[PDB]
Amino acid sequence: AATVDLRVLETTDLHSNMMDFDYYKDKPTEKFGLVRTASLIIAARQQATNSVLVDNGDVIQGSPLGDYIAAKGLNDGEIHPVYKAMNTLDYAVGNIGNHEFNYGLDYLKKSLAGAKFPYVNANVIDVKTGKPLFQPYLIIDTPVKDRDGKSHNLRIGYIGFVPPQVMIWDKANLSGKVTVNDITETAKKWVPEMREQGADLVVAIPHSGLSSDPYKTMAENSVYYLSQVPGIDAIMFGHAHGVFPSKDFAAIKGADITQGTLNGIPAVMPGQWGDHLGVVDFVLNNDQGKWQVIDAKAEARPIYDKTAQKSLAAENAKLVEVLAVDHQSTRDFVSQ
Numbered sequence: 265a266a267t268v269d270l271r272v273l274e275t276t277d278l279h280s281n282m283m284d285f286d287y288y289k290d291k292p293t294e295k296f297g298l299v300r301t302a303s304l305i306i307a308a309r310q311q312a313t314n315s316v317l318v319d320n321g322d323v324i325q326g327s328p329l330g331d332y333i334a335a336k337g338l339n340d341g342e343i344h345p346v347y348k349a350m351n352t353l354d355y356a357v358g359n360i361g362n363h364e365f366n367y368g369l370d371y372l373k374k375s376l377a378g379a380k381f382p383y384v385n386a387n388v389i390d391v392k393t394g395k396p397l398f399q400p401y402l403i404i405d406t407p408v409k410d411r412d413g414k415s416h417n418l419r420i421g422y423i424g425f426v427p428p429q430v431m432i433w434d435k436a437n438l439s440g441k442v443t444v445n446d447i448t449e450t451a452k453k454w455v456p457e458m459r460e461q462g463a464d465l466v467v468a469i470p471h472s473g474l475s476s477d478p479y480k481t482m483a484e485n486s487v488y489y490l491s492q493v494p495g496i497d498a499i500m501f502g503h504a505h506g507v508f509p510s511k512d513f514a515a516i517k518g519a520d521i522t523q524g525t526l527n528g529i530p531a532v533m534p535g536q537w538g539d540h541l542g543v544v545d546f547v548l549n550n551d552q553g554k555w556q557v558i559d560a561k562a563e564a565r566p567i568y569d570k571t572a573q574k575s576l577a578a579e580n581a582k583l584v585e586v587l588a589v590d591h592q593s594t595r596d597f598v599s600q
């Protein structure tokens with residue numbers, strides 16, 4: 265007879281924009297940066313009794329901080345500054361995006377080793393073993409409180425995916441070392457196993473966009489097809505750098521833009537560079553024994569209100585201090 269509210273939070277496509285600072289203009293901004301998204305995370309946690317946080321990928325590359333560190337290397341006794349930051353925000357799990365491969369598998373392994381949260385990816389296959397190179401999924405026991413304040417253990421499964429097109433985009437680094445299977449086929453292979461192994465919920469984290477064009481194997485943007493795979497309870501997506509739900513996707517088959525669902529499944533894509541936080545909310549009930557989803561909604565919360573022209577998320581001082589040395593080193597890197 266227990267009813268549990270559960271919130272799933274998501275960052276995506278941070279692209280190493282830790283600071284709310286434009287290094288080319290050498291000026292602060294209110295419009296991007298994890299130091300501002302962090303404020304949305306903290307606020308969303310205060311509203312929700314139970315919450316978990318994931319990252320979709322495209323995190324270690326794509327802005328001056330990422331360029332500075334890729335050139336510097338990770339052999340100086342320090343972890344990547346993106347993880348210096350993210351390690352303080354209580355992430356449950358990370359997913360591998362396409363740009364994570366840009367500097368080679370060795371740099372990726374070193375980078376992920378500094379993250380204080382586990383990573384998943386199910387579709388990258390090691391050529392030498394014929395089996396996944398990374399951890400395809402994790403089932404993570406998670407304490408939750410119901411609406412009466414009683415505790416329960418909820419087993420949350422998380423599964424990750426990257427576009428097969430990394431084989432072209434990172435041909436030098438990947439060709440002959442890995443292959444990458446179709447996103448939807450990979451989900452059909454593993455989701456039944458996750459549920460058989462006791463996952464109460466399955467959260468898919470595909471670094472992949474949204475299209476309702478006819479399915480063709482190896483589709484880069486496979487979220488619609490994933491929404492049709494049984495056993496997936498939420499889809500925390502990314503890669504397209506757009507905002508879902510929004511009017512931009514009203515024509516997608518099966519999309520309910522107000523509710524943030526695709527064929528009834530909640531799904532969210534929170535923009536780029538930390539300019540939004542993804543928020544999926546579930547209501548779960550165990551009335552017949554098993555946990556069932558009785559309600560599901562998704563929304564992408566912006567750090568900046570474009571119509572009012574004002575900030576909706578403060579620059580977090582604690583995270584600015586974590587990043588201070590690396591911030592000045594990034595300014596030096598750009599000016600050299």
Ligand SMILES: [Fe+3]
Pocket residue numbers: 277279322503505
């Ligand atoms: Fe990206």
Ligand SMILES: [Fe+3]
Pocket residue numbers: 322361362363471503504
């Ligand atoms: Fe991407």
Ligand code: NA
Pocket residue numbers: 314315316
């Ligand atoms: Na939590």
Ligand code: NA
Pocket residue numbers: 528558559560
């Ligand atoms: Na529903």
